[PDB]
Structures are given as C-alpha cells and as structure tokens.
Amino acid sequence: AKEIDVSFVKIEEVIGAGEFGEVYKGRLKLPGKREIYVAIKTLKAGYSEKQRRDFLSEASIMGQFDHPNIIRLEGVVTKSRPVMIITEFMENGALDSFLRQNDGQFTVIQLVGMLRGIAAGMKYLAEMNYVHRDLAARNILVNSNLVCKVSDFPVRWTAPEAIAYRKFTSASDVWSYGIVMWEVMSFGERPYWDMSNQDVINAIEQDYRLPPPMDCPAALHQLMLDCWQKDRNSRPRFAEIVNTLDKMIRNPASL
Ligand SMILES: Nc1ncnc2c1ncn2[C@@H]1O[C@H](COP(=O)(O)OP(=O)(O)O)[C@@H](O)[C@H]1O
C-alpha cells in the first residue's frame, strides 16, 4: 500500500468505467524516477466512508500480489480527497474489446501466448488461495506488448457447481478460464451467442459444450473441453494448463 502524493499524478482522459467509478489515463512522475503511464481509478462522487473502505479493499487485495500477469498496484492516494487507486497502464484495455476490434489480426501462436500469460497469473492466484469468481475476457487487460494481466479484484462464465451449489473454488476458476480460451480463439465472440442464461444451464447439464472456434487447433479445443469437465476434480489445475500451453509453444507442430 504505497502512498502516492497527488501532486505527482497528472490526470488525463477517461478510459473506462467500472462499478466504483471512472478510470482515467494519467502520468505518474515520482521524484528522481522516470515518468510512467498509469490508470487512475476513482470512486463516484459523494461516496460514503463505507464506500471508501470497500473501494480501498480492492487496493489491499491487489497489493498482496506481485506477478507479471496480475495488474500491478503502483500506490494509493488516501491523504487527500478524493481517494484514488493508481495501477499500471494497459494500453490496449480490456481483452474482449481488444480482440473484437482486431478480428483475425493475431496469429494462433500470439493468441496462445496471451492465454499462457493469463494461465500463469491464475496459477499464482490459486497458489495464494485466492478464488477469482469472475474470470472473463472483459476482466483481463492487455498492454502494448500484448501481455495479458488479470484484473477485477455471470452464468455463462461460471462452472455448473458454482451456479447450482455456490461452490466456488480454483476448479470453478478453471471452468471460467476455458470460456476465456474460447473467447480469445474466437476473437471475442459471446459464449453461447444468443442463448438465454437458463438455456445455457440446461444445455451444459445435458453435456453440451461449445464447439471449436474457426481455425482453432484441435489440441487447444481439447484443453477447453478438459477445463469444462462436469466433475471439478477432473479438470486440469492451472499448473497443468501452463505446462500444456508451454509445450504447445515449444512444439508448434502440435497446433
Ligand atoms: N490498468 C488499466 N489500463 C487501461 N484500462 C483500464 C485499466 N484498469 C481499468 N481499465 C479500464 O477501465 C474499465 C473499468 O475498470 P474496473 O477495474 O472495472 O473499475 P473499478 O475501479 O470501478 O473497479 C476496465 O474495463 C478497462 O476498460
């Protein structure tokens, strides 16, 4: 929880809106240090003390992590009003909109590298006994070098036992990850397209699973299907997902 003097922060244009408030692009210039771009997360005007505490709890969770595929907390502004959370800036924004605006414009190996980064971030979260519960391409951010990082600290992304019995675990996080794999390899198609939420639940219970996206390697779609096994203990763990994607990257004939 590093405290940042607000005079070191220059707020520029709005780049997003979340549950808490607007997110801005900005510049952070600490004394003696090279300026960097940041995202500045703000809290909607008029917030109460309880809303302030809930907002800053995002920063306290984020500050526990230090991994190249988890969004980095630069610091917080809490000595002055309004409160702000300052994170690293991700030039290409959310992964789902990034892919939908770049349909077809990345190679399979680039997309696999994106997925490997997301899986490494999730492995790290799971090792720290953090269950994300909301993993989806809209909650992954992408930087200028196409590195993907988990952020956000929804029936069609949720494992069936999390829907039916409220059992959320890292294995339900792996189900969601398989949906993210399908989002990525389809360049941001909507999972299950225009099916209703109840139609999705009923179909999954009768063993429907999403088909391979166009031009998706068979081995990548099989890994999706492994993430979507009904029995949560049959799903691969994130450590195995990373190893599988690494082997695909090392042996690209397998794609
Ligand atoms: N680090 C970042 N870099 C670039 N865009 C970001 C960044 N963080 C958030 N955004 C944009 O702002 C949107 C809302 O962010 P979110 O984390 O949901 O806000 P909140 O502070 O309300 O939780 C994101 O979907 C994304 O478009």
Q: What is the 3-state secondary structure (H, E, C) of the chain?
A: CCECCHHHEEEEEEEEECCCCEEEEEEECCCCCCCEEEEEEECCCCCCHHHHHHHHHHHHHHCCCCCCCECCEEEEECCCCCCEEEEECCCCCEHHHHHHCCCCCCCHHHHHHHHHHHHHHHHHHHHCCCCCCCCCHHHEEECCCCCEEECCCCHHHCCHHHHHHCCCCHHHHHHHHHHHHHHHHCCCCCCCCCCCHHHHHHHHHCCCCCCCCCCCCHHHHHHHHHHCCCCHHHCCCHHHHHHHHHHHHHCHHHC
Q: How far does the centroid of ligand 1 lie from the alpha carbon of residue 195, in Å?
A: 28
Among residues 142, 120, 3, 29, which one has the least CA distance to residue 69?
A: 120
Method by which the model was determined: X-ray
Q: Which domain does 32 fall in, by range? A: 6-88
Q: What is the largest CA-CA distance in the chain?
A: 61
The resolution in Å comes to 1.6
Distance of CA 175 to the CA centre of its chain: 14
Q: How far does the centroid of ligand 1 lie from the alpha carbon of residue 253, in Å?
A: 37
Among left, alpha and beta (phi > 0; psi -120 to 50; other), residue 214 is beta
* Peptide bond between residue 213 and the one before it cis (omega within 30 degrees of 0): no
Report how far residue 236's alpha carbon sits from residue 220's, in angstroms, rounded to the nearest whole number. 13
Report how far residue 164's alpha carbon sits from residue 45's, in angstroms, rounded to the nearest whole number. 37
Q: How far does the centroid of ligand 1 lie from the alpha carbon of residue 57, in Å?
A: 16
Q: How far does the centroid of ligand 1 lie from the alpha carbon of residue 248, in Å?
A: 31
Report how far residue 175's alpha carbon sits from residue 160's, in angstroms, rounded to the nearest whole number. 9
Distance of CA 210 to the CA centre of its chain: 20
Q: Are residues 70 and 194 in the same domain?
A: no
Distance of CA 5 to the CA centre of its chain: 29
| Count of domains for the chain | 2
Domain membership of residue 130 (yes or no) is yes
Count CA within 13 A, CB hemisphere, residue 11.
15
Q: Which atom of ligand 1 is nearest to the CA of 16?
A: 12
Q: Are residues 231 and 152 in the same domain?
A: yes
Q: Is residue 208 packed enough to be buried (19+ CB in 10 Å), middle (13-18) or exposed (0-12)?
A: middle
Residue 131 · residue 238 · CB < 8 Å: no
Among residues 161, 239, 160, which one has the least CA distance to residue 204?
A: 160
Query: Which of 11, 14, 23 maximizes ligand 1 atoms within 8 Å of its Cβ, making it the mutation to test the pocket?
Result: 23
Domain membership of residue 1 (yes or no) is no
Q: Is 134 a catalytic residue?
A: yes
Helix 238-250 × helix 108-127 angle, to 10°: 150
Residue 174 · residue 236 · CB < 8 Å: yes
Q: How far is CA 159 from CA 35, 205, 223, 235, in A?
A: 42, 11, 16, 11
Evaluated on CA atoms 100, 152, 147, 88, the torsion sign reads positive
Report how far residue 36's alpha carbon sits from residue 88's, in angstroms, rounded to the nearest whole number. 8
Helix 238-250 × helix 170-185 angle, to 10°: 30
Q: Are residues 64 and 99 in the same domain?
A: no
Q: Are residues 246 and 126 in the same domain?
A: yes
Q: Are residues 106 and 70 in the same domain?
A: no
Q: Which residue CA neighbors atom 10 of ligand 1 most closely?
A: 16
Helix 218-227 × helix 238-250 angle, to 10°: 180
Neighbours of 199 (CB within 10 A): 14
Report how far residue 233's alpha carbon sits from residue 46's, in angstroms, rounded to the nearest whole number. 46
Active-site entry in 54, 134, 152, 199: 134
Residue 240 · residue 249 · CB < 8 Å: no
Ligand 1: lining residues by beta carbon, under 6 Å: 15-21, 23, 39, 41, 71, 87-90, 93-94, 141, 151-152
Domain membership of residue 154 (yes or no) is yes
Q: Are residues 178 and 120 in the same domain?
A: yes
Domain membership of residue 126 (yes or no) is yes
Q: Are residues 156 and 198 in the same domain?
A: yes
